[PDB]
């Protein structure tokens, strides 16, 4: 706490629980002249505001670093992990040598149906993503998979296709900010 301003809710003269939308009550409410701390009643998702940016992303010579406004209201100890990879929970491992990688690559080309990504991962104690990064399958297998996917898509009704399109649009919208 750098600043010791008095803090205020966004105060109505009326009952806020019954008349939150009534602007008139807000207009009526006068408060004594001076500086206040009105903490925002909002998530800081779309905001480029300087009171919203974290201190690590502020520059070293920024005066705003010292001021207490990027408030750490939440606590990482209390919050549980969401869609977190197994590498993040128990650390990244760089154990597999070149020979092992070469063997994996050989296996994958030979028989991707038998030696699938998950199986490789299980064998070598490593991620399916990493297996993918390491090794391409036989392009034939990929083509087959694409054809299967196309067939599945064709098997849809009109409605399902539209829903999938909508989902895709939503996904695109998520990454806009």
């Amino acid at each position: 706490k750098q600043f010791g301003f008095p803090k205020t809710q966004v105060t109505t003269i009326y009952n806020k629980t019954k008349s939150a939308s009534n602007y008139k009550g807000y207009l009526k409410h006068r408060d004594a002249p001076g500086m206040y701390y009105q903490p925002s009643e909002s998530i800081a998702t779309g905001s480029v505001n300087s009171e919203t940016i974290p201190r690590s992303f502020m520059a070293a010579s920024d005066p705003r670093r010292g001021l207490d406004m990027p408030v750490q209201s939440t606590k990482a100890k209390q919050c549980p992990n969401v869609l977190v990879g197994k590498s993040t929970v128990n650390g990244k491992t760089y154990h597999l040598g070149p020979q092992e990688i070469d063997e994996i690559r050989k296996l994958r080309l030979d028989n991707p149906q038998k030696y699938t990504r998950k199986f490789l991962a299980a064998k070598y104690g490593i991620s399916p993503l990493f297996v993918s990064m390491v090794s391409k399958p036989s392009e034939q297998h990929v083509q087959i998979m694409e054809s299967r996917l196309q067939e599945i898509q064709s098997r849809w009704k009109e409605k399902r296709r539209i829903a999938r399109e909508d989902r895709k649009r939503r996904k695109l919208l998520w990454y806009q900010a």
């Binding site: 009643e41 909002s42 800081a44 905001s47 505001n49």
Partner: protein, 138 residues
């Protein structure tokens, strides 16, 4: 990975340099036609010169046509007001001209109660959220 979305800027006339909305006014009259008397008098009588001196960013065209006397303004937004000044005296014509020069060119429009400010800017405080409110509901 990051990609741009092609987007264009919005001009706020006032904030940097004010470009005056009224760009051109056309005084139109008739030599015949008793409805154009006050307009004719205005054109004659040293008022137009004074006006032009006052407002050198507006150009003042003076045209002759057979019909009723006309005051057509021309604004920065591209819209055109045209006021017919038929049978108006000199002073009424001048008032009309003043009104025209005052106008920002935009179309006339019904406003609802307290529809005062028109912002392009995102809210300084955020938008309210029930999870992030100060007083939690019950």
């Amino acid at each position: 990975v990051v990609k741009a979305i092609a987007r264009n800027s919005i001009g706020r006339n006032g904030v940097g340099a004010f470009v005056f909305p009224c760009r051109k006014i056309t005084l139109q009259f008739c030599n015949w036609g008793g409805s154009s008397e006050g307009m004719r008098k205005f054109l004659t009588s040293k008022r137009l010169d004074k006006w032009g001196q006052e407002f050198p960013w507006i150009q003042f065209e003076v045209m002759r046509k057979s019909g009723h006397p006309l005051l057509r303004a021309e604004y920065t937004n591209g819209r055109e007001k045209v006021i017919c000044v038929r049978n108006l005296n000199i002073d009424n014509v001048e008032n009309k001209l003043k009104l025209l020069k005052d106008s920002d060119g935009d179309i006339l429009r019904r406003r609802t109660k307290n529809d005062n400010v028109e912002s392009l800017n995102s809210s300084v405080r955020g938008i309210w959220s029930p999870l992030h409110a100060a007083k939690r509901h019950r």
